[PDB]
């Protein structure tokens, strides 16, 4: 239609800027990264945003609300993703044997 | 901290079905989630492989388990190589 073609345009053309993530990663490493790191790390974070919004619209469709996304559907989105291990936290030393 | 992903993330939520005009608080939650994800991946990458260096190989091992993200990384790298060859 005429909205699906505009939505497909924003699904492809949108990206995080490489001039800021290279500034963001290098504040964590200390020295330097490469261009093929920033190209991949800018691409995984678009999949991760698409992992949340496609699942936060499943929270909103499950409850009785409309397309505008309140934060109620967004804290619930991170809760359901974390219970399936999708959201990694490297500060919680987990233990499976008890 | 200011918001470094305020205008970029509003295009992306529209790209996955949200609205043309999302809420500022929802955009803020998404920006915080993206920063936390990038930080976690960078620490694990520094630990795995070459200590103190984050490489594409380390990032690929870390994302190997999740199918959607692994496929995207492989496609982007292959397309980048192809574009360099075309140039």
């Amino acid at each position: 239609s005429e909205e699906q073609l505009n939505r497909y345009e924003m699904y492809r053309r949108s990206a995080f800027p490489k001039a800021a993530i290279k500034r963001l990663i290098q504040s964590i490493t200390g020295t330097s990264v490469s261009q093929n790191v920033v190209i991949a790390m800018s691409g995984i974070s678009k999949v991760f945003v698409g992992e949340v919004v496609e699942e936060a619209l499943d929270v909103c469709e499950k409850w009785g609300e409309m397309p505008p996304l309140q934060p109620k559907h967004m804290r619930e989105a991170v809760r359901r993703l974390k219970s399936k291990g999708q959201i990694p936290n490297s500060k919680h030393k987990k233990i499976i044997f008890f | 901290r200011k918001r470094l992903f305020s205008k970029e993330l509003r295009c992306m939520m529209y790209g996955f079905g949200d609205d043309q005009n999302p809420y500022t608080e929802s955009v803020d939650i998404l920006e915080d989630l993206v920063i936390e994800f990038i930080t976690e991946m960078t620490h694990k990458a520094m630990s795995i492989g070459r200590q103190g260096r984050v490489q594409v190989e380390d990032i690929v091992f870390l994302i190997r388990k999740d199918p959607r993200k692994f496929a995207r990384v492989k496609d982007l790298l292959t397309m980048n190589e192809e574009l360099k060859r075309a140039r």
Partner: peptide, 26 residues
């Protein structure tokens, strides 16, 4: 020179269509 000016035109239309009014929520 063609790659340098055309890169910012994919993002310039990404500030005219999406996000016209800024909302909030209780």
């Amino acid at each position: 020179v063609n790659l340098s000016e055309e890169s910012a035109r994919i993002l310039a239309t990404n500030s005219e269509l999406v996000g016209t009014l800024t909302r909030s929520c209780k």
